Write a protein that binds this ligand. Sequence first.
Ligand SMILES: [Mg+2]
Ligand SMILES: [Zn+2]
Lengths: 112, 107, 53, 99, 56, 159, 171, 280, 94, 85
Amino acid sequence: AGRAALYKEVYNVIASDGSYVNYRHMALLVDVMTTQGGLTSVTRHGFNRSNTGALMRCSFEETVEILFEAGASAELDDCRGVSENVILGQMAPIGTGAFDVMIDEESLVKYM
Amino acid sequence: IFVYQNNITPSAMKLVPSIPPATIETFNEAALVVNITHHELVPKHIRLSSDEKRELLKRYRLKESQLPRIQRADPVALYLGLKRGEVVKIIRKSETSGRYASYRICM
Amino acid sequence: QQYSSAPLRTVKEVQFGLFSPEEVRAISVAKIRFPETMDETQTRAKIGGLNDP
Amino acid sequence: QNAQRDAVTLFCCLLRSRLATRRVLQEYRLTKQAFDWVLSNIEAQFLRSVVHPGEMVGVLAAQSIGEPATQMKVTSGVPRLKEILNVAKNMKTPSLTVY
Amino acid sequence: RLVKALEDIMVHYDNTTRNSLGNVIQFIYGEDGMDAAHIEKQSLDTIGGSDAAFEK
Amino acid sequence: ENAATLQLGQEFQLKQINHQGEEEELIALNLSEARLVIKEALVERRRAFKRSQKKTREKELESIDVLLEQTTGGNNKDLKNTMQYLTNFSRFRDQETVGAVIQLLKSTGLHPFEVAQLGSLACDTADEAKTLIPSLNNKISDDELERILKELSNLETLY
Amino acid sequence: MFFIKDLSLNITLHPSFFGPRMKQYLKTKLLEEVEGSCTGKFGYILCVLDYDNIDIQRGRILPTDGSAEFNVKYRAVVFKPFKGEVVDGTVVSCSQHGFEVQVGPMKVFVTKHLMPQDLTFNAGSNPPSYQSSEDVITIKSRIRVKIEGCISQVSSIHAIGSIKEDYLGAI
Amino acid sequence: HNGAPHHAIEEAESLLQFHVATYMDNDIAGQPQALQKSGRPVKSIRARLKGKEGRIRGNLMGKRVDFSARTVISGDPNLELDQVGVPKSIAKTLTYPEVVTPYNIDRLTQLVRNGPNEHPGAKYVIRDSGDRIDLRYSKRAGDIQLQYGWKVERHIMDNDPVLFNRQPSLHKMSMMAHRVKVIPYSTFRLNLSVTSPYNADFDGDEMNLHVPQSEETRAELSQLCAVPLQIVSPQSNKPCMGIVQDTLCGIRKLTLRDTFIELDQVLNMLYWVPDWDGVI
Amino acid sequence: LRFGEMERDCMIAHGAASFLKERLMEASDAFRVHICGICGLMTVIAKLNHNQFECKGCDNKIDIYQIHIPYAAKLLFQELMAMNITPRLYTDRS
Amino acid sequence: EKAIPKDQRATTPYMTKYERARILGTRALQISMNAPVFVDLEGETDPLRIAMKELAEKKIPLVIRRYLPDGSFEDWSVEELIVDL
DNA sequence: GCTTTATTGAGGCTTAAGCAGTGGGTTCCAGGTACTAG
DNA sequence: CTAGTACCTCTTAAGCCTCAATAAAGC
Ligand SMILES: [Mg+2]
Ligand SMILES: [Zn+2]
């Protein structure tokens, strides 16, 4: 019910000036703000307090405090986030980079 | 099921865990005056069995923590008495699609 | 920039554990004991100090 | 299978409403070949309309929610969006509606 | 703030929007799984119309 | 630390992983089996090269040397030295003998390293065998050890 | 010590070499690496078997570079000495500090202090040899010695041994 | 080592702790900040990682680019929707490392012979070893024979995809690929319609152009983010880019039932349409 | 020019991962750093001319892998090391 | 064990736009590096056009690894994929 | 019957956050004081 | 005598400690 009310309020405020936004975006926003047990506010005290990649939260406003917390807790980062790959300068698992391209040695012979 | 009129003293709250095998839930008279499920905003919540949970995890290939979380003190959870590690299916009506089915696991 | 024989492969995970003093000593090739960043005449860097070669 | 059927329930209702026998025969005069071509085109367009895997849904949603705010009794506009996004324990202009 | 919060959410080949941790935000992208661009405003005849109109 | 007290390293575990992920038991081989597998590999390499290009201590050594030179020859000089070391003081010259030896060692069910040493190293007395491998002291009965030792001695080829 | 195990090798190939023969070429590069390899981690690689049955996994394409990285898993036999083992070798050279013994692809050195009292070095013969009350040692001799220490080099392995227990030495 | 009174020892230890804390974190809440010898606070590692100026958001999330240009934009009705005008000077400065191939060996050799000064040319020829040789500094540029596997930094030519963006990238459609069209002027020129997705106003607005430096990047830009593909906006599932103000007024006036056109103007309008079938 | 965060997320939405990798690793500062397979620390002694690889922290001889990352990444890693924080770069998933 | 067999694949057989762009870019990069061409060239030199023609003729021998969030990967050949664009 | 407890909560103070990009014109080599070399 | 050289100098979100009441256990 809280998620539905939040979505309705978002739709009302967006449509107050007449602008139109597709329902899917609002649904995704409310879902991410409500994916946890409660409502995760979009602030440095909300989603930034989750257990996501340390570098991903580092890029937010809290930069060195999160690093100290990770060092104290020895947090492990799987580098599946966008920020981790961007910092590492590697193709992130995004769209083209989500998958990988290989070579078929059996089709090559017949295609030649 | 035990329902109180005004409030519950902390002594009863700490005594409730004294009986593991028997689960006791405390509800307020004011809270239960009007049924929450009858509200339009709240979707339809259906409890899922352990076998259903295992099948869902196998098909979607999810772990316990990957599923959406729901607070223990959530009014819906208290209404259904959901326990820890229990998955509940939520069927909702939306404008973009006729219905949508999600799942929530208590934390 | 320069040919290297080491295998090339992107990083997949990054642990953020603490840096032990023993590991610091083991990896610290040199020692710093001279506050001056340069030697006399400002020609050579202080040996065993800041900006050591 | 149940999830797939549930997802396309609205589109199935749309097809039944539009591809009705009365409409196809009374409102429309499609033939066998024309009807088959229509079915094939509808199927192809629906398959193309499927969400492309790997698309950054989150970033698109963020941009779509942020652009109207930049373009733009009871609090509304940017302050209302900021309050909604934040926890907003205290309400500047709380309201309630009862029918 | 919105970009930072939604940066890690992506739709996978299973048609589920998941973040870096893998938590499923939505089992179906927008409850439909269709592409946002292809969506368009269309009228439903079943919802409208009277009983006599629906019958005829 | 690696020693003879079965304190193998982090990688020399009793179990090994397979290309398909299946777990198998470590398998060892003796000098004769090593020579046999090396010869089979050389024959396979020679056959591969041929198909790709198409479209008594005095004679065997020369054949082995020329075969090594023809394929995988000149890349490294250590291969020839290892081949000479294996061939000069080998024990079994027939595939049947090594097959029987490995089949008999299979029934024992001991550690692959221990059975490999027993089939390769030569012993004549129980005390000598025990002092050779003190770790494998209270594992094999004296009668069984003597029987396997005499069987191995009898199976030795007469060159 | 004569152990057969599965090894995975990553090989980089330029996209220009993409014809049908590339496989063979790849195999050639495999033959130029496994042969002669000597790493402390995996020890010394002796041989690779089942050449025709070698299976190559699908190549990996770099995100930006056109090179293809193939991970090939192959069964190979390798040799690695262990402390306390006894092995037989042939004397290759003589010196005042001792005589080096070539065993397989490796060398073994015997400490002078750990030699029999009867055994004594002698330079009266060309080349210098060792004389014992009941044994004779020369350049061309099969000597069985116990290995007590192992040293790992970049591309070599050395052993330090001694001959004190009975039944050791010339055989 | 010279006797420990235990009184000054505490002061020395506190001073050392303060210095270490300032080095690791110059800004400590409710404590004095160490002052550098000069008239500025001492910069610490924690300060070096704080935000915009920090390495996290100053050098990792957003970092400077080598191959790129920035300059004013001007309207151009005579340019295609996906075609963007580019100054000749910017085109000469910006280069693409095209690898030498037999298919275009002659074209690359001609470009090298032209030289960096001439716009249809190149400024560098990367050899197989990787060393770069400058053409302007070398007087024997025409004597260099290209070989397969080498790379040449050729000036951007026509039909060369390049990303165009404006600094306030509020929405997704603020950065789109355009086909380069070399023009003899110092101002970027883009289609009238693409102003709407960019929110361009031509009142001195400055935009940025980024040139891809690899085949992968070119293919991704052409196939993923292309203006023709960006016409439909997922934000409102409707075309964000459409007709422009003056064009809208002109088309409205043309469509009026009382509007009639002479034969000459009709023929000219028919000819203007490049894809006109040919039948009047 | 500066590749802003807004442009970064816009390109992420576009899905051009290759473009972003090239922009942040080729068109920008580019460095190649060596890391051990056990300690995962950039402090590895690598003489390319002599082709000699050895890390003082861990008693290893040949366990070194090369990774291409922006100079800013290694600068941040060194700064964290100064704060007794060690980003252990590993090429495999545990 | 993570690898899924060729059959029983839940991914969409139809080609995705991101996959098409990646395949075209990889083919163009390979061709630019003097890679073999499986389709006769009729006076064409642009690598992108050659890659598009090969994709149309399904002569591209590349592969696509559909990676599930858990880690399992499914292999798909370019020939079997359907290009709706 | 009285005394001493664990608990509940409620605010002061505190430490944090604070659109993106880019063009330009000015200023710092810091002040005094004592000790010592030519 | 004279001049180097260095040494001193506006609007919210979470944590925590500090306050005022309250039912039970000791005795
Ligand atoms: Mg303007
Ligand atoms: Zn190391």
